[PDB]
Structure formats: C-alpha cells, structure tokens
C-alpha cells in the first residue's frame, strides 16, 4: 500500500519512461541489425540475446505495473492491454511490431494516435460511401473487362486491386486504361468518373480524419498540461449572453 504507491511513483517517473524508451529503441535497433543476411552466427547469437534481455525488462516493467495498479486497474487502459498483448505474445513472427510501444509509452505520441482513433467514428459514413463505390465499381469492371483483361479484372479481387491502383492514379492511363480502350473504346466513360469520384471521396476522408484528429489531439494536450481545455468560442458566447440577461433583469429592477 505504501509499496504500491512508491512503485506507481517509479512507473509514473520520467526517468523510468526514458529507460523503457531506451530499451524499445535498443530492441528495435537489434531487430534491424538482424535483417542483415551476412551476419556471423555469433553475431546473430549476441543480437538474439540482446533481444531476450529487452523482452525480459519489459516483463518486469509490465509486472511492476499489473501489481502497482492491480489486475483490473491495469487492464482498464487500452494502452496497458496493448502493451500486455504485445509483450505476452512474444512468450508463446513480426517481433518488430514491439517498436510500436514507442507510441504506447511516449505520451505526446500516444495523444497523436488517440486523436486519429477518436476521429475515425465521424468519418465512418464517408468511408462506407467509398467502400460502396469500390464494391460497385469492382463488380462492374469484372463483368465489363474480366474476359478481355483477366490479369487486371478477371475476378472481383483483381478488380478491387486494379481499381485501388487506379484511384491512386498510378499508371492508370498508360498502363491500364489506354490498353483497355484499344479493345473497349468507351472504357474512359467508366474510368474517368471512377477517378473523379474516388479521389474526391478519399480526400474528403483524409481531410476529415486530419482536421478532427488534430483538434482532438490539441484538446488532449491541453488537458494533459493544465487539467482542462479551451472552451469552444460557441459556448464562450452563450455565457456572454447570460451576463447580459442578468444585466437586463437588473436594469428592469
């Protein structure tokens, strides 16, 4: 109980964070050195020991945490969970994902990610509309072009892949649409509207995420530093209205 408190004070320490950071980076650097195919077996052996170590430190850390907060207190945070899964999973193939923990552990990084996650609900409808345009476009392109262009359109999967490439504008004309039009001369009537509508919609999607993510992140940075945020101008004005109701009611008296 005094122990809990002294440990929670270690954990919530800034030096302790710096140390977990340093270990994430180290574990990351070593997984990077291990991509190098030319390494001696002793080189690889060291590196792989450096990694067992990193992972052991994380076990202690997570222990120090589940303890100083209890099972239900730790698992109350999605970040703790994420930290827990990522570390636990290594105890049972892309280990480099452990480097994501730079996000869970560094607060300003965590707040960028939380802004983005929190913005996802409010673009869900733009994303659904994009999804529907894709699905429809892919069925039509399969039926229209699948028999004459089967590597690009031969089945629904192929069509979706190709249309995604088309929406990114990558070789959409020299590589896809001009060859298509040599066999189907009006194919531009399909492809040009597809491009116009998906590029508009995907930028609508991007801009909505970003504008909202940034506003959320900024409120969170405010709360984290002063315990509150700026009131919306919206509600500042309403309050000004209140002081003017209590002046018109004191002026009638």
């Amino acid at each position: 109980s005094h122990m809990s408190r002294k440990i929670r004070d270690l954990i919530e320490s800034k030096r302790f964070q710096n140390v977990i950071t340093a270990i994430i980076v180290l574990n990351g650097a070593v997984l990077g050195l291990l991509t190098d195919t030319t390494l001696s077996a002793s080189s690889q052996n060291l590196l792989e020991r450096v990694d067992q170590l990193c992972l052991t430190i994380f076990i202690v850390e997570i222990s120090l945490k589940i303890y100083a907060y209890g099972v239900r207190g730790f698992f109350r945070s999605g970040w703790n969970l994420f930290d827990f899964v990522i570390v636990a999973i290594a105890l049972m193939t892309f280990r480099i994902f452990r480097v994501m923990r730079l996000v869970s552990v560094i607060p300003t990084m965590r707040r960028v990610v939380q802004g983005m996650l929190l913005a996802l609900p409010g673009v869900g409808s733009v994303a659904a509309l994009l999804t529907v345009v894709f699905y429809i476009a892919a069925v039509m392109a399969t039926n229209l072009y699948g028999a004459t262009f089967p590597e690009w359109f031969g089945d629904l999967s192929k069509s979706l892949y190709t249309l995604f490439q088309v929406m990114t504008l990558e070789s959409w004309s020299m590589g896809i649409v001009r060859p298509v039009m040599n066999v189907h001369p009006n194919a531009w009537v399909f492809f040009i509207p597809f491009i116009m509508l998906t590029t508009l919609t995907v930028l609508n999607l991007f801009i909505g995420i970003i504008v909202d993510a940034m506003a959320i992140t900024k409120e969170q940075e405010e709360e984290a530093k002063t315990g509150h945020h700026q009131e919306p101008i919206s509600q500042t004005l309403l309050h000004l209205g209140d002081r003017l109701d209590r002046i018109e009611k004191q002026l009638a008296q």
Copy 2:
C-alpha cells in the same frame, strides 16, 4: 387512415430499415458471386433466384411506401424517386447499381451525399473555369501536336483524354511530354503552364466541394438529431449587439 399510420410506423421503424439494409447487402453479395465465371449452372440459378427474391422484397417495401404516403407524398422525395426508378427499372444492365440503395436507405449515408450535392452549386464557377481551360487546351494541343502525335492529340477527343491524364500527372513527362519535345522542343511552354493551372484549379474545385459538403452535412446531422442547428457565430454576435442596444436605451432613460 389508422392503417396508413401503422404502416408509416413500420416503414419509419429502425427494425424495418435494418431489414431493407440486410436485403440490399444480400442482393449485392449475390451479384458479386455472380461475377465468378467458374460457377455451375445450378449455382448461377440459385443466385439468380436469390436476386428475384431481393427484388421482390423491394417491390413490397416500395408498395408499403407509395401507399402509406400516397402517390404525391412519396414522389415528393428525390430519394423515394431514386429508390423507385432503380427498382422499377429492374422490371422492364448494371443491376449492381441497386447497391446504391444503401445510400438512400441509411440516413447518415444519405446526409453525406446530400452535403456533396448541395455543395455543387457553389463550385459551379470553378468547374466552368476548369472546363474552359480544358476546351481551349484541347483545341490548341490538337492543332499543335495532332499531326505529329495523332494517337495522343489526333482529334479533340484524344486531346481531352490526354490532357486529363496530364492533369492527373500520370506519366505526363516520361510518357507524353518528353516524346513530344523530341519533335517540338518548346512544348514544355504549353504543358508546364497547363499542369500548373489545372492542378491549382482542380484542387480549388475539390477543396471547395469538401469544405462546403462537410459543413452542410454537419448542419443536417444537427437538425436530424435535435430539430435545429448551431446558429452561425456571425448571427450570435448580432444578437449580442441587440442586447446592448436595449441596455444603452434603458441607460439613457
């Protein structure tokens, strides 16, 4: 009259919407399975029955609607009409367009689309300017390059297609402009200004649609949930001016 009301209450139900949704998706999934060229004839036969069914359910739905609102009440909504045409047309070649009904039937999706449609008027002039730049650029490119580069510029249609590809930046240089400059060394004086002006204008077009669409959609989401929207800060301030005129007029008294 009590029937009408009990049916309108079915139709406007949330369970009924969920069911029409489920049928759109089903009809959609089956039109997707039917792109698959390898299907047995019995497989295709089933799928095609699953589709007759979906379309029959939509007939009933639309019936339940034209009735519970009458001919003129139903046809008062552009969405009802859209629903009606799309379903009626199937009763007389891209049937997959029926999946658009996910937009007409799901309200938050409908509001995204309405925001976009409603924003179109206020960019009509940017779009016209883009149209004029294209038309002019295509006439000039036809006259300048049509004889030496006829696959890309040989007629007005070819020129427009090529210029659209150029504005999207797709192979504009390695694939179009460098080959053009080997014959017409100053062609960069045409193509580089075209690119600068159309990319600026089309992004002006995109940003205007999106900024307006989003503001409209957000007002509509507000009205749908509370029957009104936020007053513009603009007009909140004017009202503050009013309470200050009735305080300066009570203070002169």
Copy 3:
C-alpha cells in the same frame, strides 16, 4: 447623352450578356470543329465564315461599349482592355483564346478569376522561395549529374525540366533516381530532400492561393449582390467593446 444611357442600359442588360455568351460559345464550337483534319474545303469555308461573323459581332459590342462609356471610361477596366486586345489582335494564331471571353463576360466567372489574381501578391514570398530552391537545385544537379546523365541534367534548362518532373513525383524513382543511383549511389541524399522540400512548399503555395482566392471571391460575390460584405468577426468584436465603453462611462455618471 440619353443615347449613351440607353445603350449602356443595353450593354448592362442580361439579354445582351446572354447573346455575347452565345456568340463566344459559337465561335468556340466552330474553332473546335476546325481542328478536324478530314473537313471538306467547303465545310472549312462555312466554318471560317461563321468565325468572321462572330468576330464582327464582337467589334460592334466593343464599339457599343467604347462609345457608351468613352475612351477613358472603357479603358478604366482591365477586363474591357482584355476584351479589347483579344478582339483587336484578331484584326492585324491561337484564336481559341477568344473563348477566355467567357470569363470576362460572365460575372461569377470573372469573380473567380479576380479572387485568384488578387491572392497572388500574398503568396509572392512562398513562390520566390520555391523559385530559389529550384534554381539552386538545378545548378547543383547540372554539376553533379550533367556529365553522366546529360539528357536529364546536361544543362541548366534540362535540370529544371527534370526537377519539375521530380517534384510532380512522375516516374521520379523508376525513371530518374534509380538509374542515377546505379552510377552515383548517394544521389538519394540530393533527390529525397529536394522532393520533401518542394512538395511541402508547392502545397503551401497552392493552399495559400486557394484559401485567399476563395475568401476574396466570396466578399466580391457579397458586394455584387448587396453592395457590401460581412464585417470580419475581428471588427464586430471591437464594436462590441465600444458599446461597453459607453456603458461603463454612463455607469460611472
């Protein structure tokens, strides 16, 4: 003097504008039909008469204008001048530029263009910075790569062209930078920073034009329709401060 006034009333008419519009479009459509290389000589002859006619109507129009406003009144407008040059020039090679007159004659189109022109001053410094980055990058790329890659970098002109292509991201890697790195393995140290800095700066340029152009255009549309614009919230608030100074000064009394 009464004539002047009755003519100025014709000119400023909405039917007269519709008629000049109709003639611009006609002249435009015919210059378009004339790109078609397959035309009979009689077909071309007609079309070319349709064009002499269009241009004659414009002479009358401009006459009706220089008269009903006098030499100095007409030439007081940049649009009148533009109209005058474009029409006069045809009386002494890209005639299709006459279609620009759709912009000079249609007011909502004119206001889009005026917004863009008026926004140019306030991005002049971002544009200059882009210009400087290009100039410097092109000198360095010429010296670094000109001897080994002379078609892309062999002189300053070649370098600028190539770098413009690189900033648009068009084949920048498969077509330019990977071949360059086969001879100069660290060339990515030049090209990747160039891309990062020019794409950031050119989007800064684009966004500044567009945000300002749109705000200006919107003020102009306001003035054109009601003779004034919205006061900036900025100055609305200052005025609110004024009414509160005359309430604190009446409250001290």
Copy 4:
C-alpha cells in the same frame, strides 16, 4: 559610437539591402553560367572573377555588420550566423548555396522561412510516428521480400528507399507490388495498408506544418509592420467578460 550609428543606419538602409540583393543574384547568375560545359577558358576566368568580387563585397558587408553591432550583437541572430558561416566557408563545394542569402537578406522571405522552422516543433510527434511506421515497415519488408526481391528490399536501406517511393505512389503497383505478388500473392496485405497509413500521416504532417507556418508568418508580418499582432479572438472574448464583471459589480452597487 556616432560612426557605429551611421553605419547601422547604412546596413539597415533599404538601398543597401537592394544592393546586397543585386549582388546575391549576380553571384547566382554567374554560378549558373558556369554550369555550361562549353565555355572558353577566358569566359570561365571572367565569370570566376565576377564571383571573387561578389564574395569580396559580402566580406565588407559582414564586416560593416560585425563592427556596427559588435561580436556578440551580430552573433545574437541565427541569420547573421548563417550569413557568416556561408560567407566564411568560401574562405577555407556547393557554392550555389550562397544564393540562400536571398532568404536571410530579404525580410518577407526570412519570415516565410521562420514560420516554417517555428512550426516544426508542433509536428514533431506526427513526424516521429511516420518515422516509426517507416522503420517497422522497412524491417518487415526486408525479412519478407529481401531474398526474392533484393534490389528493392535486399537490406534495410533498400527497403526504406523503396517504401519512400511506394508512399509517393510512384510506380508502386506496376513497378513494385504486382511483380512482388507474382511471387508472394498476399503482398497486397502489407503494401496497401502501408500506403493508406503513410499517405494519411504524411499529409497530416504537411497540413500541420503549413497551417501553423502560415499563422506564425502572418503574426510576424503584423509585428514587423505595426510592432504588434492581432489578439486571438480567444482573448478578445475574455476581455469582453471583464467589462461585464465590472458592469455587474457596478450594477450591484
């Protein structure tokens, strides 16, 4: 002391600035003429004298400055330092960088750059997140594809280069991902999420820089011209609250 003041008045002069500008441009134009490989040795000799001259003028300038402000006063400005290094370095290989001095010497250009530098801190976390996604993606692509695609993925450096090309969307599909999928058919499960996440994040990075840079630059342009800036609407409203507290406190009296 009177000398200092009369020299500081020269230096801070508008004619003196115009003259340093003119010399930067000249030095720049000559370094440009010197890229031209065809020059006579006498042509190159002149040009190289024109450059010694330019650099001498800059020595005097910098002297006139270090003097009229003293060692610690001059070196108090990052721009003076930059000017000093750039000029001093030439006294000990990309000399064309001297043209950057157009930025240090022209104030509206300096303010664009200061806005951008000052905005960098507040996107540091978005940039770090992009850095982490890249690092992780490059380790995984090396392990997944390095043995079968070693020119693109054969080591970490190769992977990062390729992924940067992929994020710019340049030939990402016809040139990289389709060839990859012929050997590793599910590679789209890696590449398409990479593209979606990096393009979203890099645009978040770009938009944050630009929005902040522009706001900072605009405040700086305000201060430079009137010695102060616009107060944030934020704080204008708070002040309005103050005058309403001194009216409710005078109205209770």
